[PDB]
Amino acid sequence: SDVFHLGLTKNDLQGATLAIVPGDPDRVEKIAALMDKPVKLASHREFTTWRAELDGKPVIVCSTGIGGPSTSIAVEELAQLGIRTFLRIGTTGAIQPHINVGDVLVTTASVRLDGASLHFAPLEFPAVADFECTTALVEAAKSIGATTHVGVTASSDTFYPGQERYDTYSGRVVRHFKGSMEEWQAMGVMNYEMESATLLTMCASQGLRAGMVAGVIVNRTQQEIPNAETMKQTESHAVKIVVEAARRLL
Amino acid sequence: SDVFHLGLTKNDLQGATLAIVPGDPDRVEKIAALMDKPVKLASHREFTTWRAELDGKPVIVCSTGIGGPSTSIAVEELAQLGIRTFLRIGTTGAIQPHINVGDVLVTTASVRLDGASLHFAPLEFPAVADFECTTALVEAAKSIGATTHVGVTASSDTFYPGQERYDTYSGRVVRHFKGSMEEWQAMGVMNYEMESATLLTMCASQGLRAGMVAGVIVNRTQQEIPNAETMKQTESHAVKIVVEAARRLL
Amino acid sequence: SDVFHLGLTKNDLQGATLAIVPGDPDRVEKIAALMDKPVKLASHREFTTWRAELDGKPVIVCSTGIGGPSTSIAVEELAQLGIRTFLRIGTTGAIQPHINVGDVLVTTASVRLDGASLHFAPLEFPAVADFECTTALVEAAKSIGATTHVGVTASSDTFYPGQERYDTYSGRVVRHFKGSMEEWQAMGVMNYEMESATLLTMCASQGLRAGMVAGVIVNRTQQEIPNAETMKQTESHAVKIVVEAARRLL
Amino acid sequence: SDVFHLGLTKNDLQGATLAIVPGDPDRVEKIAALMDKPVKLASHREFTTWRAELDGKPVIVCSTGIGGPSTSIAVEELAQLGIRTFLRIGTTGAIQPHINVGDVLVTTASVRLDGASLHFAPLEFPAVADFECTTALVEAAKSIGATTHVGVTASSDTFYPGQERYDTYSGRVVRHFKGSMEEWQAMGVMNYEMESATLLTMCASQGLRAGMVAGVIVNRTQQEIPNAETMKQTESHAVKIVVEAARRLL
Amino acid sequence: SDVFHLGLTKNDLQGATLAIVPGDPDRVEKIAALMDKPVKLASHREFTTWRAELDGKPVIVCSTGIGGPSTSIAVEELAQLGIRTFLRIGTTGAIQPHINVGDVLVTTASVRLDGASLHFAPLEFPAVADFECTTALVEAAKSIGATTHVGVTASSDTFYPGQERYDTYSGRVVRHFKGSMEEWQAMGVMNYEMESATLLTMCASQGLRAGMVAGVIVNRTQQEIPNAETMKQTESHAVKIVVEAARRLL
Amino acid sequence: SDVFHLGLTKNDLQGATLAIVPGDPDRVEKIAALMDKPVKLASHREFTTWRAELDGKPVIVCSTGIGGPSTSIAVEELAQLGIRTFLRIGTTGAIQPHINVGDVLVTTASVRLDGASLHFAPLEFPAVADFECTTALVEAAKSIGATTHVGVTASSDTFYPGQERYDTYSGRVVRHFKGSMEEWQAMGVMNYEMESATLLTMCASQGLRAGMVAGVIVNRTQQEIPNAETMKQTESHAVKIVVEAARRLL
Ligand SMILES: [K+]
Ligand SMILES: [K+]
Ligand SMILES: [K+]
């Protein structure tokens, strides 16, 4: 391999310069299957990589795992291999009452509640998305009639205390995160997830283009028993949106 | 007056909800005169306010003075009077070799080298522009033929040490800022100015829309004797862009 | 002009080494008019400058605008022109019940709730006034029988959230400033204003002498309808005190 | 499943209270096979879990993935299922000249170069190992004849800039981390890895026992072409040590 | 003297490489008297030094005074004279209900609520004890049947506000320390004292071995009138434990 | 005793409200003997206390030991016994070329390179002296003919790395303090010592008056073999000044 972790050579990419980067290794095949000539390249640790073709051009699909540290390894090693544009697709929990399950969120910039972003730029630097990527995601969402919200996301190194969850082993949250969800809500923040602060900071500070889209599967502000069906449909629409955005960025 | 500093009543605004916010009080009349039925409302301290009409709708032009503290007063008191969209117009100095004098810069987000932004949101929150305002500024720049750069700006509470200037009384820069210009250059930052970190943070955290455009009149990386005519033309260029963007946001 | 913003040459100063620096461009003429041979030198942006003569010696009066950033520009450019002593005169709101409207405050040092001070010295460095300037202000206050208080001032980059005001567009204050006024009150702090942290830090860290005096026009701790008359009288006494202090420092 | 990510019920564990936690999901089966009656329980994302029996008692082996965020999910959800002791096993790169490839490292505490540890305790709290777990790991290492070093480890949210690697896409390291490797070397730090600051802080602050052992496969201070056989043998050595330590902690 | 403060020459030590370091100059003679051939060397400021012999080998006993600053002077100057192992003995107040008066505490690492530790290593570095010293203290405690607890200690630059005491001149505690005792209690912290953060950080970052033991004389969580007798007995047992640990470290 | 550490009752003080606070317990008797009817009250740890009479009024002399932690105990327990004015006397090393051995320094405020000051007020609060105490010290210095410097002091929790000394066991200084002495020199700081940041912050934030004077016995910027007689004379000079200042503050 030409890189330390992903198990890829530059020849494997066949000249690709764009990658779609989901979190779950199990979701990579689903995304690749929407495009032409899908081929599995490698599977090592949390990093599963396929290649496919979109309008005659090679594109990469590679999983990051959960969190900024493993995300930073995938993005760096793909950059070493020639990738210059990175599109993240995820699912997410909204923290605003006006945002519904089934909706799509496009992130303009993120609240940096992570550690890895600091290894690229000091805290004062914005975790901001690329303008061309954000534009392509909004236009792709419109092309299939999705209800879309555009704005700021909170990006946390934990699933539990950093998202103010109390249903845990200890049942408590450290002082600095107590009351934090209500503060982000007042400041207009749409949602929580765990990788965008790292992704957006490391790309914007190194001349790489990045964008971020997610489907809403749950809402933290109103109690409701989730419906597995609505949730599956919502992930499928987010995947088509990221693929269509990619088409506009080739 | 209905507000503490600006010397304005809500009746004076005639229902306006958009304001163009330059820094220099002597620039307010020149911007207002490009639109219909311009009238002076007030002048107190660094805050000079005119009203005009664009495509039949009232709009405000109001100066901020230099720095985030006076900016924060103007934005708050305008919001008290009904303004919900804020467009900053300026001229600026570039720190990248590929950006030329006469070019136009549209800011997606800012590095927070200020104090007032912290009084609205903690450092981790992004100083990010509104997507609709950024889109209007970019599309207006293309409509008149400008060469445009879109990206990150460094926003400083000083003109001298925070912009790493050594041609000063002391000729010294505090440790924290020594070597800072070269760091921002490596990270792709386009330019320095002094009000956007405050403006963009206070608006993004309070449900108000803001954007920012500026004309390039000097470049810190290439020695050149300034041309007064070229600099006047560049200012006029940027002002035409901010008025046309306002037209798209009514 | 020999400087970038103020529109002054060194010859304009006629050998002056002391400046009185109020905030409001409109108040500069009032101060100059107490002295001999007053002459207007320049008006650009928030910076209005006059010259006059005190006991046969030239003195400068120059406005700063509101906030540390514009203050830092005026102080630097005046230093480039030969000024070595800076005396600030303002009006202010007290936060202690024993301090009355009509009283005069002389500041020994300031709480650094600003951004520009950090561009001169790290936070651990004290925003302390010059001992000779503080002495001259206290003695000048005694010479006209003013009721005087000497101590610490809190210096904020905002008028609204940083001074814990809730009568605003949003009606809220960021976590770190919630409860802050009561903490400063317990620690003996006399008042809030917006420029002294910057002024005192940048002078004490660069071999320049600075002092600070203000008249009390309002008290945050007891509700009362302000009297425009008492307020005008109080600003007039503070102006005579700063002029008399200057006389003792030539 | 009784937990959100791991895909496990409490019944699956058969009363287990100790878990061995490697990073790589493909290493879970190899560790479990050294013990009696090994069986696969689940595999979801980077989390692969097996059960086995040691001296008649059930034990769990569960992968964390790379970085503190995914580590924090595995540790929390295992604790929800009844686990109270956590033993980390890895391979690593040394930064001291006297430490040789083939040696074993036991960590007493870690330098916190991560984000997730802050979500459990403020920076001032020590990322310290449990004394009983450290004692068992040291005594097990001596029982099989390993050359062992006991001391402090640097635990980083990145593989590249946080470990001061320059052989990258950008070839740059942010100011804060320039010269950092030489500082840690002078302070006696043995090595870099990426999960221990999170693991040790979250356990020490919540009444859970944790320890950490690793085999040295490379040394950053001496150029050497790696030997694949030597590296495989070193991994097997460290795994035998972590199983024997578990035997002492039942 | 060969050093600035302690009044010692290297010859005075007769080849000693281990020191026992209590806080109170008055307690040095008591410790020395348990060993062979005790001799008083010097008394200057808070620094009183004796020499004695343990199993035929010279050992030093030297007081630190109260706090990290004076501790840092004693440790440095003893290191200049050849000392490489440092054992602290103290008395302390427990903050856990299960810990009783009469018990002995051995500290694995400390919460850094001091200033001097930062002059040796940044905050992220752990204030961790040496593994051989901690082992010797635990084994010495067992040899006389003491009830022993092993874990984390909070180490404060103050006796009053930093340990959340309200029975003071002012009757208040600064915001950041309000509620702090209950947070440390929840995180498993055993006790407060005032020198171990400095001692453990400066030794672990400079190749010196250090450990820490204390007798419990009071418990912050249950009201009780202290018994001078139980307190004297408890200090005597801690002194024998430190002497016996030293024997195991020669 | 009415207090925990000092071994004093309120009756012992005979109504005293002013204390002179040297660092060295062996200096307490020498200061007290310059006044009338001197008597020893107590000696415990680094705290030695005498009473004497000045112009018919009782005054206290009490040692602090080295560093802010022991200083904070002495000041708190004296305040509990009725003391409201605190005068620090010391000898010190200058860091400016124009300051000579034999000169006297009066401190207006201090750089906070300590930990204990943070336990009373956040870093942004100024470590500033009382104006009445500073005035008395300056006027007393002039009355006896001393060459006096008035200004800022750097106050450090260490004698060695925090004062950028390299003549040590390790010969290293942590990154944060490398190049620090030259920064403070450029900023006009006169000298280093180790207790004033704590003393001045705790008093200014609690309604207590404090000041500080010191005699210069060495200069870090000019190599010179110290003269023992000159150094003894300089100490006596500073002590005469602090007694005469006390006389003016009764
Ligand atoms: K201004
Ligand atoms: K991961
Ligand atoms: K001490």
Side-chain angles (χ1 to χ4, degrees), chain D residues 18-26 28-29 31-56 58-141 143-177 179-231 234:
Chain D
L18 189 146
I20 298 168
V21 289
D24 181 352
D26 284 285
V28 179
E29 187 178 350
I31 291 155
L34 297 154
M35 298 176 282
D36 302 312
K37 303 190 223 173
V39 185
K40 184 188 181 191
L41 296 186
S43 185
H44 282 104
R45 297 186 175 255
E46 51 259 69
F47 312 112
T48 287
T49 304
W50 283 57
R51 195 188 66 240
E53 180 185 291
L54 190 54
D55 287 354
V59 173
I60 289 286
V61 188
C62 181
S63 59
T64 58
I66 294 165
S70 57
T71 297
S72 71
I73 289 171
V75 174
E76 168 66 27
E77 293 185 11
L78 290 168
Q80 287 178 20
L81 270 349
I83 301 301
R84 302 285 174 266
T85 302
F86 299 85
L87 297 173
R88 182 127 185 114
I89 174 81
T91 47
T92 184
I95 66 169
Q96 294 294 340
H98 69 278
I99 299 178
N100 297 316
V101 161
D103 292 0
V104 164
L105 310 183
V106 177
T107 299
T108 55
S110 299
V111 191
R112 298 174 53 182
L113 311 175
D114 72 322
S117 64
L118 296 166
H119 294 38
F120 297 93
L123 192 55
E124 59 264 29
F125 188 98
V128 61
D130 180 84
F131 174 79
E132 292 180 299
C133 297
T134 301
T135 293
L137 292 163
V138 167
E139 290 180 357
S143 77
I144 84 163
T147 125
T148 310
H149 308 276
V150 181
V152 175
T153 292
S155 186
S156 173
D157 266 2
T158 61
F159 187 83
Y160 293 103
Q163 307 190 24
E164 217 187 342
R165 294 193 153 85
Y166 290 92
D167 51 321
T168 56
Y169 173 68
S170 76
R172 93 163 164 85
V173 169
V174 71
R175 187 209 297 235
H176 180 77
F177 283 104
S180 64
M181 188 169 116
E182 172 183 347
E183 270 286 88
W184 309 133
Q185 292 174 305
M187 293 180 185
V189 179
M190 307 184 294
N191 71 308
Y192 287 113
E193 55 78 69
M194 301 177 60
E195 299 75 31
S196 72
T198 298
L199 177 68
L200 301 179
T201 304
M202 81 181 288
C203 288
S205 67
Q206 295 191 92
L208 303 168
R209 303 190 304 170
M212 181 160 67
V213 65
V216 179
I217 66 176
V218 67
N219 188 313
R220 297 279 303 273
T221 73
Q222 56 99 47
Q223 178 278 323
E224 190 179 340
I225 302 292
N227 187 294
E229 178 64 22
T230 295
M231 282 187 316
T234 298

Side-chain angles (χ1 to χ4, degrees), chain C residues 15-26 28-31:
Chain C
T17 63
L18 187 149
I20 293 162
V21 288
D24 183 352
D26 192 47
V28 174
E29 175 163 22
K30 290 180 169 92
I31 294 160

